[PDB]
Design a protein around this ligand. Structure first.
Ligand SMILES: Nc1ncnc2c1ncn2[C@@H]1O[C@H](COP(=O)(O)OP(=O)(O)OP(=O)(O)O)[C@@H](O)[C@H]1O
Ligand SMILES: Nc1ncnc2c1ncn2[C@@H]1O[C@H](COP(=O)(O)OP(=O)(O)OP(=O)(O)O)[C@@H](O)[C@H]1O
Ligand SMILES: [Mg+2]
Ligand SMILES: [Mg+2]
Ligand SMILES: [Zn+2]
Lengths: 618, 189, 173, 97, 594, 196
């Protein structure tokens, strides 16, 4: 009775707003023309609230009774809209109803894994956090279709589960019917049965937002059908779903615990990424106009870490690393990486850690690790078991997680050789090889490595040769494209400048804050320095839509520079090698990418040579 | 300036008490002033005090009555409405009509407090029962006030039979909220 | 005119867009002593912005829609007035909203703000009425207090003091 | 610190000092002790407490035990001519305790 | 029958109690209902005074009587709030003698007991059942169950033919509450002779959850009950009230809890013209001299201000202090006092510490076979002070794990498939001895310090304390110690530990001063002068072991900001800059010059 | 820009107002912010110089009408803002001083010379007002309605045999009087006695 009234009311709501009808028509037209779009519609809670307050409130506080009616109304509207002449047997037998999706503003239901409490059960909530785990995808049985040869008719059965439907129903064992009502033998029609994908993920509270002295908490989320593979570990997501409770929770006499609560999880409706900034026509035009400037490189380099005084060359190297070179794989099998690795060895208090933090924040994908805080296994991959399935699998490590990204390693010299070996393999081959518990696989690890280290004595000594100063293996050192040695030199002018800069920085106050006040979302769906968001947009554009190709003049410059540097009496902080030629080519390609140029020109070669010369001979 | 900030636009509880003590009250004189010195007052009437006989009902001002009571020279006759039966009837009236307020005297709370503190032996009924009845009436009226506070608007507002102390308590919040609503509406035009 | 909170409210920066070419007005811009071209976008204090907008045919400046009166903020206000944290949006939200409404003769914002104020004042009065008691001789209260605007803070202080004084007089020994 | 066989969880065990609470701990051949070993008792001998921060176990114990130790001077025989410091290899803190 | 009479008696107690002219519990219930706080705190002395029979009934069978009291409270609340609301919670307060945690035995089964301990672990909130909606599989019969959380309940065994256990819970129509598990250890001073501290399992419900953090002493009132996990029962405590000396709510929230009478006591104290002297004298009153170290400890406790730049760069706001000195300097006693006075503090020994002890440890759950992260002294002491005694004894490996914690105030873990960045915003107060046990002036400073410059640069102030044999000072110290052994100003020259802790919390949560331009100019001039002097002081033989880098400028800025915060001053002037410069010269430049 | 100094001064005025509100009994005005007001006045002088230069340029120059109008309006508005900030700060301080003057029957280093002269003249005016037809009343009296004719008081600070108009009260410290509230109201006001 009430169910039909709610269905009719949601039908009226959908009729009033023609945008959803147009979206459904477009999806159906695209599917008919042809890879396929899932039967899902995103509706705005604000429009529903403006239309009917009662329905919006019910959906927010009592989704179990108000969502299925809306889904049925949407399915009926789509079916009435459908005009397919011949429905395929699988289509007729398919159980594919339209699923509703929500956006807008969740006033008090916008929470985090820490703030989810028993008072929010059976309510629509929005959870924001970081994905830490991801179960394997497996199909789930909802409908079974059978055939009786003698009768010549198809019989079907429908299955339900605690997680498949919002409303509780009698449990249904997965035992396939074998016999008809009259005793007729039945044959299972797998091709006509309906299965849907199922996956379980764990969303973790963001560590920065956790209380003082308390470890982050996490909540389990269930994804079905088209939301199965929308996330990977390490992603920041905004999940919308219905907080639910499952099981007896010790109520049953079989559990003697009498002190154990119920199980709880979320049945996800949406997954909203929190990584790629959409580029507008105005943004693209601004990027092009800024790139056309002759000194674009200087401005972009200066815009990185405005609070760090000096270190211009290190900033240029970081920018080139962010832009990255062009990766070429030859037919014979040789693989040439386009990533640029950077190492900084210097005296204490030289802004190495701050630079690492800044590159961690700015880079689209970045993972931070420490020397003493990491392990070989924690870097590569760990063997573990899947709760959902109970299947032996692999868990991505630091290196793996940062594929096509950047990994920042702090205190690089405070590590162990055991741990070092993993890294050595990673940088050398850009792949991870695992041989454990009957697992034989190769993991792609294509990440740029930026690390900071200290001398063995804790202070760089000019008298002693570079080999004695740094204890890291020579083989590991050779993989780094650029090595920067930074020392703290006492000079009156530089000391005064640095002190004034630090004092000016320490006097900053945030907007909307009174003096002496200590430093403490609305919607879900939603020579001048360059602002950081614009820098991110520029980096994304350049790294996505530019692949510079080499030219003859750049080659002449590169070979001239290599010949001059390798056979020169002047000593170098790092030995010259054929890898230096590849480093020069990579830096030239990165500089070409900076200017949004399809070809590498003499300017790029000159800039790369200057940077390499500064890094080598200071 | 001349007037503190907390005394601006409102009365302090002491001022409300001072206003209340100007009202008349019935007493039983324990002395015979009438003849068969003389009070000469300029704010109230002095005829009643001069023509006062022992154990004979007479009407005087509340503060004069309290001054006499301090000397044990007069027994204060409690108001008729301050009986257990009348308070019970008022509670029943409040319960039966969730939309209106009972027709209690405008000074019931202040007078009740004053009489409980100053005249404890004058009451015919036990003091604790009266305190409980007054507390229950106060909570019911508070519920009604909270329910009625939801209708604040830029236009007028009616609160009938509400006592003086409750109005004094609510004056700041009600006045400021209605003033801001009126300001917003005026700006809208 | 001499009320401190009104002076502070008029100092907030609002988006603006010049419509004329006025040399020598760079001091408003970040750089001093340079001409300011038309259509330039910058933020000016309310006292300068309002007068420049009204005075100046084509006026000197056009007042662009602020971020405090955006669709997102309006939707949040409609969804949950009590849970909405107005202090982070602005510390003089009601004063600036009244000024904007007076400037632009609009009624939708007036209705929204009136509803928000009423629904917030309900909880404000609840909290003000709530008083502590010493049995031997909080969290929600402070959580809501952190979300209040300046005018709401003043009203809360006045009402709380009135309630405390009445209770003290009633229960004085 | 050990892992409990039954509960498979890190746990705390007592030592010589613990066992000697409100008692005496006797350390024969004090001078033949390892440096590391020797250094252990520094906190116990004055603060009368043991602090442990291992495997997520953050706790402070009570060690109210007196220590009587026997040692041999450097070289196997005391040289009465030299100062006391040169006759033994112990450092200032341990000697002061 | 009897339950109705008990409920009526409790209702009468609630509606009739009064000590002068205020109905304490009636008004308290109304006020609690106003702010959506469905509970009621009852003082047991008042219950005893009103009627001893009610107290006797409550004490005899708490698990059966308390639910009736909750029902009575709910009925009274409905009467007082609604003009014709889940079940209310009862929180108890008592002054009965505290039973030692180890003295809890069979004799105290199913009784209300009061005890104090240290919380060492807290669990994640679970969900309990209060109102259950059930349906029968066969005949589909709708039924409901009301459950109280006090254990001496299950789904019916027989339907109302249907098989055993025929009812299935309908979840969307049920109501749940919050539950939490706590581990309570016994106070170190109360442990018996030669015994390991004992742990006790405890549970809290609804409004008693999220009230305590690990490592904080608390006092607990609850029921000593037992649950069957065959001839034995696992003991546990059902919490009825939590009383702690640390405002945990104001620590983990930007919200601050302080009564109006408190706020105005801390303002009057701040208005004192010489609060600095009072606080300096209030630290380690039993230790003679060491005034500069006491001032440094005051600065460390107050801490500086932390700034987050628009670009994302974050600046540290915690002050670290190192004490390198000879034996008998009373460094360990100062560390113990700092651990006692600070709102949050952990006292650890370098010797008895590890890399995994002091940061975080990957631990595998025995049952789930899943790896989790436990926390160490620098996670347990987040927002406080870590006293690392015997700093010199610490192994290199262990030591090296502290750098990021001290400087970046974060913990990076990449182990067993766990990739996370924890938060550790702590101040480190360390004590150590030179290489040879004394600072031998004959040898160079480099030979007297085995610490690498990298670790030393992180310490804002380094104190090289040398014991000088002066007859006058020796006599003064002997007299002071003798008076201590053989033997309360509280006249404005010193404040007790509790008041100092509360003031520290208030100042930290209230003020975050800023430097004025004159302060910045003076500080830049002093930094240039100090660096020039260090450059001049260098000798060809060796380079300065004590470093002077930008970190020292940041440390001086932090000291100035802490001095300004001491007086609740929104701005730091040259007056505080002078004191900060004097402290730096007295400690770090004093160590470096030698 | 231009009004930042005035905004800071108004922020300090708000801080002073909050301090006044929070304070229970004793209030001491902060030090007159001479430096900020000096900077504001210097800025006003610079704006006046700008206006004079603009007028001279218009008299002999290539400046056109629109530019001159806009610059003049901006300068005038900036001057108005600075004047408003200064006047608001001064008015708040004067109001607090007025309350202090009324609190007494009719240190100073924080006040400026103008404020000290203003306070002296206001006290003289209050005394002159008290000297008029309202002599029977004591305008600078208690604003709490009289409640009890006779009260118990206790001496808080030792003093000699002070001879009041109503009588002679030998104020020995730690000695109680049972007297009329009217007679000893002034002594309570000055803090010599206490109602308890
Ligand atoms: N060039 C600089 N400009 C501004 N601040 C600086 C600069 N160099 C260092 N600092 C300050 O140094 C403080 C701490 O130094 P930082 O952690 O960056 O050192 P680091 O290079 O990681 O050295 P190490 O790890 O060897 O101690 C930072 O807060 C930053 O303010
Ligand atoms: N100035 C002082 N006033 C009072 N007691 C003192 C003073 N100096 C030392 N003592 C006492 O001397 C003893 C020294 O022990 P303590 O553990 O405090 O030393 P320490 O400085 O940490 O030295 P160590 O490096 O040997 O551990 C303690 O009992 C302390 O009370
Ligand atoms: Mg570092
Ligand atoms: Mg010690
Ligand atoms: Zn049945």
């Amino acid at each position: 009775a009430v169910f039909g009234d709610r269905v009719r009311r949601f039908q009226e709501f959908l009729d009033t707003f023609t945008s959803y009808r147009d979206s459904v028509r477009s999806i159906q037209v695209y599917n008919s023309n042809n890879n396929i779009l899932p039967h899902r519609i995103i509706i705005s809670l604000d429009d529903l609230r403006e239309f009917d307050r009662s329905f919006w409130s019910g959906i927010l506080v009592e989704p179990a009774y108000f969502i299925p009616p809306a889904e049925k109304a949407l399915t009926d509207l789509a079916d009435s809209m459908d005009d397919v002449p011949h429905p395929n047997a699988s289509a007729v037998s398919s159980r594919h109803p339209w699923k509703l999706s929500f956006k807008g503003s969740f006033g008090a239901h916008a929470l985090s894994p820490r703030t989810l409490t028993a008072q929010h059960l059976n309510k629509l909530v929005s959870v924001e956090g970081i994905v830490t785990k991801t179960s394997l995808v497996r199909p789930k049985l909802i409908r079974s279709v059978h055939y009786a040869a003698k009768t010549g008719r198809f019989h079907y059965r429908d299955y339900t589960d605690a997680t498949t439907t919002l409303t509780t129903r009698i449990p249904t064992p997965a035992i396939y019917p074998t016999e008809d009502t009259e005793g007729n033998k039945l044959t299972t029609e797998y091709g006509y049965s309906t299965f849907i994908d199922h996956q379980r993920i764990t969303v973790q509270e963001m560590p920065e937002m956790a209380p003082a002295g308390q470890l982050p908490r996490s909540i389990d989320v269930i994804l079905d059908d088209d939301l199965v593979d929308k996330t990977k570990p390490g992603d920041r997501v905004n999940v919308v779903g219905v907080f639910k409770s499952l099981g007896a929770g010790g109520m049953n006499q079989s559990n003697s615990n009498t002190l154990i609560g119920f199980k709880t999880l979320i049945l996800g409706n949406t997954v909203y990424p929190l990584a790629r900034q959409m580029l507008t026509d105005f943004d693209i035009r601004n990027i092009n106009k800024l790139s056309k400037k002759k000194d674009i490189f200087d401005i972009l380099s200066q815009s990185l870490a405005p609070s760090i005084y000096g270190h211009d060359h290190i900033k240029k190297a970081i920018l080139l690393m962010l832009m990255g070179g062009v990766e070429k794989n030859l037919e014979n099998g040789s693989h040439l990486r386009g990533d640029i690795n950077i190492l900084m060895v210097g005296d204490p208090s030289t802004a190495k850690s701050q630079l690492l933090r800044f590159v961690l924040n700015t880079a689209s994908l970045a993972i931070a690790t420490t020397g003493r805080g990491s392990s070989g296994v924690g870097l590569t991959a760990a063997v573990t078991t899947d709760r959902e399935t109970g299947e032996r699998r692999l868990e991505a490590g630091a290196m793996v997680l940062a594929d096509r990204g950047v990994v920042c390693i702090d205190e690089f010299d405070k590590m162990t050789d055991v741990d070092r070996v993993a890294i050595h393999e990673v940088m050398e081959q850009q792949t991870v090889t695992i041989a454990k518990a009957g697992i034989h696989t190769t993991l792609n690890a294509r990440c740029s490595v930026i690390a900071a280290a200290n001398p063995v004595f804790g202070q760089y000594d000019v008298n002693r040769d570079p080999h004695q100063n740094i204890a890291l293996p020579d083989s590991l050192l050779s993989r780094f494209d650029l090595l920067f040695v930074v020392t703290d030199d006492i000079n009156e002018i530089r000391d005064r400048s640095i002190s004034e800069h630090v004092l000016r920085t320490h006097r900053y106050l945030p907007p909307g804050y009174l003096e002496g006040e200590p430093v403490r979302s609305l919607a879900v769906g939603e020579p001048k320095l360059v602002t950081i968001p614009f820098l991110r947009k520029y980096v994304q554009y350049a790294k996505e839509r530019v692949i510079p190709q080499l030219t003859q003049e750049a080659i002449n410059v590169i070979v001239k520079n290599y010949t001059d540097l390798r056979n020169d009496d002047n000593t170098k902080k790092s030995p010259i090698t054929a890898r230096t030629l590849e480093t020069l080519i990579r830096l030239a390609t990165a500089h070409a990418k900076v200017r949004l140029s399809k070809t590498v020109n003499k300017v790029d070669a000159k800039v790369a040579a200057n940077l390499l010369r500064f890094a080598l001979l200071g | 300036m001349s007037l503190p900030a907390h005394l601006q636009q409102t009365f302090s509880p002491e001022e409300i008490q001072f206003i209340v003590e100007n009202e008349p009250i019935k007493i039983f004189p324990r002395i015979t002033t009438r003849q068969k010195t003389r009070w000469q007052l300029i704010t109230t009437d002095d005829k009643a005090l001069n023509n006062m006989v022992a154990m004979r009902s007479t009407e005087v001002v509340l503060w004069i009555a309290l001054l006499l009571k301090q000397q044990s020279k007069c027994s204060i006759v409690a108001p008729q409405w301050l009986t257990t039966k009348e308070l019970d009837r008022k509670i029943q009236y409040e319960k039966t009509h969730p939309d209106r307020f009972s027709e209690l005297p405008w000074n019931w709370l202040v007078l009740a407090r004053i009489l409980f503190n100053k005249a404890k032996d004058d009451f015919h009924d036990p003091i604790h029962e009266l305190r409980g009845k007054i507390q229950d009436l106060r909570e019911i009226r508070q519920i009604k006030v909270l329910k009625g506070l939801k209708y604040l608007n830029e236009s007028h507002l009616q609160l009938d039979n509400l006592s003086l102390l409750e109005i004094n308590e609510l004056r700041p919040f009600i006045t400021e909220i209605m003033d801001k609503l009126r300001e917003i509406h005026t700006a809208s035009l | 005119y001499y009320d401190i909170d009104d002076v502070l409210a008029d100092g907030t920066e609002f988006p603006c867009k010049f419509q004329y070419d006025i040399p020598g007005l760079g001091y408003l811009e970040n750089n001093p002593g340079r001409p300011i071209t038309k259509n330039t976008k910058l933020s000016l204090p309310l006292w300068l912005a309002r007068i420049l907008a009204i005075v100046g045919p084509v006026p000197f400046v056009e007042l662009l829609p602020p971020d405090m009166f955006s669709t997102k903020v309006m939707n949040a206000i409609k969804t949950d007035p009590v849970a909405l944290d107005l202090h982070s949006i602005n510390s003089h939200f009601f004063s600036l909203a009244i000024k904007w409404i007076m400037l632009f003769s609009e009624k939708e914002l007036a209705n929204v703000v009136s509803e928000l104020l009423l629904q917030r004042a309900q909880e404000l009065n609840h909290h003000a009425s709530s008083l502590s008691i010493d049995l031997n001789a909080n969290i929600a209260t402070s959580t809501f207090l952190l979300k209040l605007e300046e005018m709401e803070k003043e009203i809360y202080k006045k009402s709380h003091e009135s309630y405390k004084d009445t209770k003290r007089w009633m229960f004085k020994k | 610190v050990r892992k409990d066989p039954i509960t498979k969880e890190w746990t705390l065990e007592g030592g010589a000092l613990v066992l000697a609470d409100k008692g005496v701990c006797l350390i024969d051949e004090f001078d033949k002790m390892n440096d590391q070993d020797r250094t252990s008792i520094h906190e116990a001998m004055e603060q009368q407490s043991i602090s442990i921060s291992k495997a997520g176990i953050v706790t402070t114990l009570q060690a109210r035990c007196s220590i009587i130790a026997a040692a041999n001077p450097n070289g196997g025989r005391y040289n009465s001519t030299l100062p006391l410091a040169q006759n033994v290899s112990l450092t200032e803190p341990i000697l002061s305790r | 029958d009897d339950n109705t009479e008990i409920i009526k008696s409790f209702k009468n107690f609630i509606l009739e109690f009064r000590l002068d002219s205020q109905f304490i519990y009636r008004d308290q219930l109304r006020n609690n209902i106003l702010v959506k706080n469905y509970s009621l705190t009852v003082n047991m002395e008042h219950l005893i005074g009103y009627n001893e029979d009610i107290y006797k009934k409550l004490s005899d069978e708490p698990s059966d009587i308390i639910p009736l009291f909750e029902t009575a409270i709910t009925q009274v609340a409905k009467r007082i709030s609604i003009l014709s609301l889940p079940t209310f919670q009862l929180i108890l307060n008592s002054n009965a003698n505290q039973i030692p945690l180890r003295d809890l035995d069979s004799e105290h089964v199913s009784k209300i007991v009061r005890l104090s301990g240290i919380i060492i672990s807290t669990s994640v909130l679970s969900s309990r059942a209060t109102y259950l909606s059930i349906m029968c599989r066969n005949c589909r019969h709708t039924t409901s169950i009301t459950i109280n959380n006090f254990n001496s309940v299950s789904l019916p065994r027989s339907c109302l033919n249907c098989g055993p256990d025929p009812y299935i819970i309908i979840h969307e129509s049920s109501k749940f509450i919050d539950q939490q598990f706590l581990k309570l250890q016994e106070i170190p001073e109360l442990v018996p002779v030669g015994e390991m501290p004992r742990n006790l399992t405890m549970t809290c419900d609804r409004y008693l959850t999220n009230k305590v953090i690990p490592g904080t002493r608390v006092t607990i009132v609850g029921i000593y009950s037992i649950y069957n996990s065959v001839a034995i029962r696992t003991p546990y405590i059902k919490i009825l009230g939590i009383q702690s000396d640390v405002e945990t709510s104001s620590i983990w929230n930007s919200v601050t809890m302080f009564t109006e009478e408190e706020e105005e006591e801390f303002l009057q104290l701040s208005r004192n013209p010489k609060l600095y002297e009072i606080l300096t004298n209030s630290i380690a009153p039993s230790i003679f001299g060491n005034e500069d170290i006491k001032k440094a400890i005051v600065c460390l406790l107050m801490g500086g201000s932390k700034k987050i730049l628009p670009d994302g760069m974050r600046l540290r706001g915690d002050i670290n202090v190192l004490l390198l000195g000879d034996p008998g300097t009373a460094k360990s006693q100062l560390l113990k006092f700092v651990e006692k006075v600070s709102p949050i503090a952990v006292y650890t020994s370098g010797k008895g510490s590890s890399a995994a002890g002091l940061t975080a440890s990957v631990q595998r759950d025995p049952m789930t076979r899943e790896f989790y992260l436990e926390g160490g002294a620098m996670v347990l002491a987040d927002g406080g002070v870590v006293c690392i005694d015997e700093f010199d004894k610490m192994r290199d490996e262990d030591r090296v794990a502290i750098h990021e914690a001290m400087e970046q105030q974060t913990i990076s873990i990449a182990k067993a498939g766990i990739t996370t960045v924890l938060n550790s915003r702590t101040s480190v107060l360390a004590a150590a001895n030179p290489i040879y046990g004394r600072y031998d002036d004959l040898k160079s400073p480099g030979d007297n310090i085995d610490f690498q410059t990298t670790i030393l640069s992180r310490f804002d102030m380094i104190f090289i304390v040398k014991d000088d044999h002066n007859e006058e000072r020796d006599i003064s110290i002997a007299n002071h110690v003798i008076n201590i052994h053989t033997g309360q100003e509280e006249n404005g020259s010193e404040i007790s530990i509790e008041k100092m802790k509360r003031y520290i919390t208030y100042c930290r949560l209230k003020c975050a001063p800023r430097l004025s331009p004159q302060a910045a100019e003076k500080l830049s001039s002093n930094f240039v002068t100090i660096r020039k002097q260090l450059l001049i002081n260098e000798e060809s033989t060796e380079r300065s072991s004590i470093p002077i880098t930008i970190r020292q400028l940041e440390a001086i800025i932090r000291i100035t900001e802490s001095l300004a915060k001491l007086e609740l001053s929104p701005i730091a002037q040259e007056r505080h800059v002078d004191e900060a410069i004097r402290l730096f010269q007295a400690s770090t430049m004093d160590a470096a010059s030698q | 820009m231009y009004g930042d100094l005035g905004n800071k001064l108004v922020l300090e005025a708000k801080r002073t107002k909050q301090l006044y509100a929070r304070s229970n009994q004793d209030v001491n005005l902060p030090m007159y912010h001479e430096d900020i007001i000096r900077n504001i006045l210097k800025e006003v002088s610079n704006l006046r110089k700008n206006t004079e230069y603009l007028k001279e340029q218009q008299q002999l120059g290539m400046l056109d009408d629109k530019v001159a109008k806009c610059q003049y309006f901006v300068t005038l508005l900036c001057m108005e803002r600075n004047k408003r900030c200064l006047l608001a700060y001064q008015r708040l301080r004067t109001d607090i001083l007025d309350s202090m003057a009324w609190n007494n029957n009719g240190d100073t280093n924080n006040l400026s010379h103008q404020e000290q002269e203003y306070l002296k003249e206001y006290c003289d005016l209050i005394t002159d007002l008290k000297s008029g037809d309202l002599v029977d009343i004591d305008l600078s009296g208690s604003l709490v309605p009289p409640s009890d004719v006779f009260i118990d008081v206790r001496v808080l600070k030792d003093a000699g045999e002070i001879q009041t108009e109503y009588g002679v009260f030998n104020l020995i410290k730690d000695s109680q009087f049972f007297v009329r509230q009217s007679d000893v109201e002034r002594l309570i006001q000055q803090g010599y006695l206490q109602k308890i």
